[PDB]
Amino acid sequence: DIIIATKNGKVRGMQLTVFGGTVTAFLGIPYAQPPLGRLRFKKPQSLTKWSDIWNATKYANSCCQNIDQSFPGFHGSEMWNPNTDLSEDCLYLNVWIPAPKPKNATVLIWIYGGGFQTGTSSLHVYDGKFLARVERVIVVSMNYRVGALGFLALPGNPEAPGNMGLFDQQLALQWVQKNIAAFGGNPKSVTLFGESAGAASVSLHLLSPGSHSLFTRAILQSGSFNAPWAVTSLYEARNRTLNLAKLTGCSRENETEIIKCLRNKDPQEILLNEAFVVPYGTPLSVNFGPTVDGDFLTDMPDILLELGQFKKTQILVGVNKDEGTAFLVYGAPGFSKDNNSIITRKEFQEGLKIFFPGVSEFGKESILFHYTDWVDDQRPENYREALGDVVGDYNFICPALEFTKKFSEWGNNAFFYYFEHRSSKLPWPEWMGVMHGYEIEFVFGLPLERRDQYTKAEEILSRSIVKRWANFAKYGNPQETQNQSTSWPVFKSTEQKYLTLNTESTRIMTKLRAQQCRFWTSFFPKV
Numbered sequence: 354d355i356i357i358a359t360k361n362g363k364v365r366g367m368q369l370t371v372f373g374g375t376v377t378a379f380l381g382i383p384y385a386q387p388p389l390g391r392l393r394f395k396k397p398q399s400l401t402k403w404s405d406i407w408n409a410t411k412y413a414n415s416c417c418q419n420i421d422q423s424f425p426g427f428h429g430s431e432m433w434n435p436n437t438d439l440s441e442d443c444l445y446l447n448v449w450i451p452a453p454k455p456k457n458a459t460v461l462i463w464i465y466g467g468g469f470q471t472g473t474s475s476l477h478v479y480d481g482k483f484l485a486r487v488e489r490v491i492v493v494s495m496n497y498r499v500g501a502l503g504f505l506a507l508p509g510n511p512e513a514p515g516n517m518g519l520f521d522q523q524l525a526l527q528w529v530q531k532n533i534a535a536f537g538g539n540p541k542s543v544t545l546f547g548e549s550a551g552a553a554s555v556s557l558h559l560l561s562p563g564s565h566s567l568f569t570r571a572i573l574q575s576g577s578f579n580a581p582w583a584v585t586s587l588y589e590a591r592n593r594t595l596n597l598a599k600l601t602g603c604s605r606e607n608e609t610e611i612i613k614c615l616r617n618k619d620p621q622e623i624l625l626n627e628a629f630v631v632p633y634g635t636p637l638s639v640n641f642g643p644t645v646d647g648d649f650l651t652d653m654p655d656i657l658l659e660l661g662q663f664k665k666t667q668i669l670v671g672v673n674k675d676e677g678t679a680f681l682v683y684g685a686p687g688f689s690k691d692n693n694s695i696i697t698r699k700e701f702q703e704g705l706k707i708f709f710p711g712v713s714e715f716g717k718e719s720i721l722f723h724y725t726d727w728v729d730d731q732r733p734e735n736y737r738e739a740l741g742d743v744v745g746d747y748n749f750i751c752p753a754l755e756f757t758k759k760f761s762e763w764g765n766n767a768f769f770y771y772f773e774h775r776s777s778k779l780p781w782p783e784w785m786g787v788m789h790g791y792e793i794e795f796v797f798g799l800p801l802e803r804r805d806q807y808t809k810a811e812e813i814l815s816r817s818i819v820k821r822w823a824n825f826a827k828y829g830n831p832q833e834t835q836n837q838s839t840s841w842p843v844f845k846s847t848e849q850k851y852l853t854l855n856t857e858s859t860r861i862m863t864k865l866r867a868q869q870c871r872f873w874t875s876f877f878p879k880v
């Protein structure tokens with residue numbers, strides 16, 4: 354029986370059997386004052402000391418959120434849905450420790466994605482006990498507020514200043530700084546990693562001065578702050594905030610007196626009104642996201658990046674081959690997870706209206722013109738794959754590549770990857786390829802469990818990725834040095850080399866999406 358004395362009081366963990374050994378788990382450690390009552394919409398308050406033994410033996414409450422329901426009973430959407438109660442009392446974090454207690458172990462801190470509207474750290478594919486067991490690192494994950502309750506912005510107003518979820522994360526980073534030592538961790542060797550909006554989060558942590566000293570290195574999986582969906586400006590933050598008030602009957606004149614109205618509304622009142630704060634949404638819509646608050650963010654992030662105003666350190670950045678296909682079955686006409694989704698030129702044209710609603714007719718013609726120069730004009734899946742590439746190149750890949758070029762231009766080592774393996778267990782149809790979110794299980798080493806009926810080639814690739822992530826965390830270099838692997842080159846802005854990750858062969862390529870990204874990053878802004 355192990356109990357660790359944190360600065361805030363004693364906490365009792367539990368022991369797990371992983372791969373013939375032990376990992377100690379502390380699920381559900383509180384790291385903030387519960388943000389309810391008058392604390393709703395506010396920055397996270399500090400934790401009051403306690404004098405008993407907190408039993409950190411089960412996952413905590415998940416933060417209030419709206420749940421995916423487009424496919425009830427379907428594992429492919431429900432693996433992402435919360436697996437603990439929803440409650441405003443949700444600011445908790447988890448710690449996996451190798452056994453026996455390491456001395457000065459590198460800490461990995463996971464920040465989950467979900468469009469800043471959904472997510473929870475208790476998901477099975479975020480289980481950190483494999484990483485603890487295999488690479489003797491410490492894995493920490495936290496829950497952070499999402500949707501309106503985590504990102505409602507009345508800018509300047511401390512009653513709802515914006516970016517509360519990001520301050521939740523930061524307060525958890527503060528926690529492992531003040532406490533990880535007692536678990537055997539090295540507060541000086543802390544690597545942030547996250548996926549989708551989690552990756553956008555860690556990219557903002559590279560910019561936030563208040564995060565500069567709370568971590569060492571950073572891993573960005575399928576996301577960056579410069580992605581079109583990732584930052585909401587101040588005028589849409591306010592139109593959205595005031596729309597929600599009109600929806601709940603909280604329109605008041607005194608700016609502050611709008612907030613106390615929302616603070617006495619039930620959590621489900623705000624949740625079901627969230628979707629309608631934008632007049633025309635898209636499958637990629639982030640209704641309440643990060644803003645320039647003058648606190649977490651001191652200025653617009655694109656300016657900070659372009660002028661080298663970020664934490665200088667190594668980064669690991671990468672994308673998946675079919676980032677965009679997940680979003681097609683949530684909106685585009687003619688798409689279905691239950692057929693081959695072969696669409697015509699006409700249907701391709703109406704998908705662009707879904708994904709680019711307020712963009713010109715000349716804008717949409719140029720997208721179609723760039724993405725329809727086929728090798729084979731007879732392929733019936735031409736337009737299907739093309740609209741998938743359009744959505745994936747615009748929302749994830751081209752921003753991620755631009756982030757890596759601009760970050761590396763200031764002298765730091767950067768490492769870019771291209772994940773192109775489709776999981777043998779992936780419950781979505783084959784036409785959707787290597788989907789958004791489905792490298793996560795490889796990173797967390799789930800195929801390392803042979804009972805889980807992953808393929809043998811998948812155990813090897815996960816083992817090699819798990820090693821490259823932990824080598825990057827520990828030593829700032831994502832090599833696998835022993836089994837004669839391909840050496841991962843630095844991403845230099847001149848040649849733009851990256852590593853493809855897959856079962857058959859890891860090769861070195863250059864200038865991922867050369868043409869597609871020039872169009873999206875240089876031309877498409879001007880239309």
Ligand SMILES: *[C@@H]1O[C@H](CO[C@@H]2O[C@@H](C)[C@@H](O)[C@@H](O)[C@@H]2O)[C@@H](O[C@@H]2O[C@H](CO)[C@@H](O)[C@H](O)[C@H]2NC(C)=O)[C@H](O)[C@H]1NC(C)=O
Pocket residue numbers: 592596597599600629630631632
């Ligand atoms: C700023 O917001 C207004 C408000 O729109 C409504 O706000 C809530 C009450 C909610 O019910 C939303 O779904 C509403 O749309 C936007 O005004 C609307 O704009 C659309 C088209 O853009 C128009 O068809 C509606 O008639 C407008 N509604 C009203 C009440 O005038 C407005 O568009 C937003 N700002 C910008 C620049 O678009």
Ligand SMILES: *[C@@H]1O[C@H](CO[C@@H]2O[C@@H](C)[C@@H](O)[C@@H](O)[C@@H]2O)[C@@H](O[C@@H]2O[C@H](CO)[C@@H](O)[C@H](O)[C@H]2NC(C)=O)[C@H](O)[C@H]1NC(C)=O
Pocket residue numbers: 685686687688689691692693694695696
């Ligand atoms: C692929 O399937 C989509 C999905 O819609 C189907 O509609 C049901 C009636 C049923 O047949 C289910 O298997 C699917 O969910 C098809 O798109 C629909 O097409 C019909 C007829 O043309 C139209 O009335 C609907 O509005 C369409 N709905 C959507 C969301 O697009 C599509 O035609 C199928 N294509 C192929 C090649 O199989």
Ligand SMILES: C[N+](C)(C)CC(=O)N/N=C/c1ccccn1
Pocket residue numbers: 419420421422467468469470471549550582636637638639
């Ligand atoms: C919509 N759903 C109920 C499945 C929750 C969710 O997943 N919301 N996510 C939005 C988003 C936006 C941009 C990039 C990635 N994700």
Ligand SMILES: C[N+](C)(C)CC(=O)N/N=C\c1ccccn1
Pocket residue numbers: 429430433466467468549679680788789790
């Ligand atoms: C939820 N996730 C961690 C995958 C990121 C996200 O928000 N993805 N967005 C849509 C989606 C929905 C189901 C399956 C795949 N992608």
Ligand SMILES: *[C@@H]1O[C@H](CO)[C@@H](O)[C@H](O)[C@H]1NC(C)=O
Pocket residue numbers: 365408
């Ligand atoms: C914590 O767990 C121990 C071991 O089961 C138990 O004896 C103790 O009463 C628990 N404390 C609680 C639930 O407050």
Ligand SMILES: *[C@@H]1O[C@H](CO)[C@@H](O)[C@H](O)[C@H]1NC(C)=O
Pocket residue numbers: 456457539541
């Ligand atoms: C842990 O490592 C740091 C350097 O990274 C060192 O300064 C510190 O004293 C070490 N502490 C322990 C307990 O090993």
Ligand SMILES: *[C@@H]1O[C@H](CO)[C@@H](O)[C@H](O)[C@H]1NC(C)=O
Pocket residue numbers: 607609610
């Ligand atoms: C109303 O506005 C004033 C300033 O305009 C502010 O000081 C006050 O706190 C607000 N709310 C209440 C309940 O007075």
Ligand SMILES: *[C@@H]1O[C@H](CO)[C@@H](O)[C@H](O)[C@H]1NC(C)=O
Pocket residue numbers: 813816817820833835836
């Ligand atoms: C290297 O090869 C050995 C022998 O097959 C294997 O057991 C080990 O897990 C491999 N390590 C990595 C990091 O791939």
Ligand SMILES: [Cl-]
Pocket residue numbers: none
């Ligand atoms: Cl050892």
Ligand SMILES: [Cl-]
Pocket residue numbers: 698
């Ligand atoms: Cl055609």
Ligand SMILES: [Cl-]
Pocket residue numbers: none
């Ligand atoms: Cl046409």
Ligand SMILES: [Cl-]
Pocket residue numbers: 693734784
């Ligand atoms: Cl097919």
Ligand SMILES: [Cl-]
Pocket residue numbers: 808809810
């Ligand atoms: Cl096999």
Ligand SMILES: [Cl-]
Pocket residue numbers: 837838839858859
């Ligand atoms: Cl290899």
Ligand SMILES: [Cl-]
Pocket residue numbers: 719872876
């Ligand atoms: Cl062009």
Ligand SMILES: [N+]
Pocket residue numbers: 864865866867868
């Ligand atoms: N290319």
